[model samples]
Target chain A: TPKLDTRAAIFQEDKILLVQENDGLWSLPGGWCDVDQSVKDNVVKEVKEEAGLDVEAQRVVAILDKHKNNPRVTKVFILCRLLGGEFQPNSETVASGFFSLDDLPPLYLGKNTAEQLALCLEASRSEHWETRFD
Target chain B: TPKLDTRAAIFQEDKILLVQENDGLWSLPGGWCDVDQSVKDNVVKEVKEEAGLDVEAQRVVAILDKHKNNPRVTKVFILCRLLGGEFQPNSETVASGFFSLDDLPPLYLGKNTAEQLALCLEASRSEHWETRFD
Candidate 1:
């Protein structure tokens, strides 16, 4: 099976959204794109559970044919519009906040990186950005 | 875990490759991006096992654009250049051959589509083809 995971790219002004994991590292508010959900639908679903925010898909910002590991995965990062709601710790994440890219926190390296966050952030700011995939 | 899978696109002349399953339906020769294998490693191994061909990664044609339509699996289609080999029946496939873009064979739609085949065809012949992803 081609496993799928998602990243909800929620940005506000010069900052983007990140959520804390139980282990204290942060990442984009997302996880598995479950089999029962449509890809777009899962993008909407993830932020709610992980960051406790209501959001909607804006556009796909990036897609990655990410492999080279045993639990390999295809990663879909969708730019999302925050509709409402606030964070309340749950299963995958603890605290959540918007941070300026110039000043970032320690990230959950297993799930995210500066390059990935920057890629999504750049796509958000661009007037004409095609989805980045590799 | 974000499960991973792959598709190997091996084309020659104007024809593309297909491997017949034990059931008689044809599909691109590929399977899981299993544990301990690199992404490129999976394609090469699967092609040899399923299509009986030796190949090397050239470039990704596209990540199959059907995650929502087939929510259970996500497929990455990578165009591969044949190093050389001959077809021999194996566990996953029973036979193999190349078929023209115009004249076709019934495909295992669970694994491939004509639209996907056509898209890769365009890339294979492009003077400078860019990878497509959405």
Candidate 2:
């Protein structure tokens, strides 16, 4: 089986925006990159729809392997800058807010790990950082 | 449909290793990425299987939008270093060789363009180059 997924790490100051799914687990504001558009476009769209925020993709931070339990390859994560927009409660994401690394919620571990999130934060802050692949 | 495809821009000196597909056109040594493996692993495997060469993925060069023609987003280009292995003509690739940008054969235009090939060459040579996206 082959699968492709994308995640966004939208940072504001030292906090990152996260969304809680109907399943009660929180994750970054992203999902599958669309085939009808560019990945950057998909990132912006996913953030608006899922987190109710407008964003612009800055660069790819990390590409991760989510193939242990399920055969899925996820590009986690992308660095995005917040443009504008408000958080609106939605069907997929009921709760949304910016969270600090020291106080993250029960995340959707299936999509990303704490270590991976840390790497994303590092990449976002660095001026010249190489994209990580695993 | 979000499809992820990987292409190996295997550089040997100033030339690149390209394989002629059974479809009667040349393209980089790669295919659809696998979920059961890492993207780097998939690139190395695809190069050996398609071009009959042992190679290692150095870094991702470009991620392209293949959404124009079809509902598919492909990671268009990857920089790979050839380790060793003789080219044995296979079913998928009927012919293979290292080609310079100046004297290139007809390519699988659907997968890559002349401009894209030039960019790959540029990325391979540069010590520091940002990954391109469209």
User: Which segments of candidate 1 are over 4 A away from where they belong?
Assistant: A1-4, A12-14, A52-94, A122-134, B1-3, B58-71, B123-134
Against the reference, the lDDT scores of all candidates come to: 0.76, 0.79
**Model 1 reaches what TM-score against the true structure?**
0.72
Each model's iRMS? 5.0, 1.8
Which 10 successive residues of model 2 chain A have the least lDDT summed? A67-76
Q: Mind listing the fnat for each candidate?
A: 0.18, 0.36
DockQ of each: 0.19, 0.53
Best by TM-score: 2
Candidate 2 C-alpha lDDT tens digits along A92-127: 789788889999999888787777778778878887
Best by DockQ: 2
TM-score to native of every candidate shown:
0.72, 0.91
Residue B101 shift from truth in candidate 1, angstroms: 1.8
- Off by more than 4 A, model 2: A68-71, B68-71
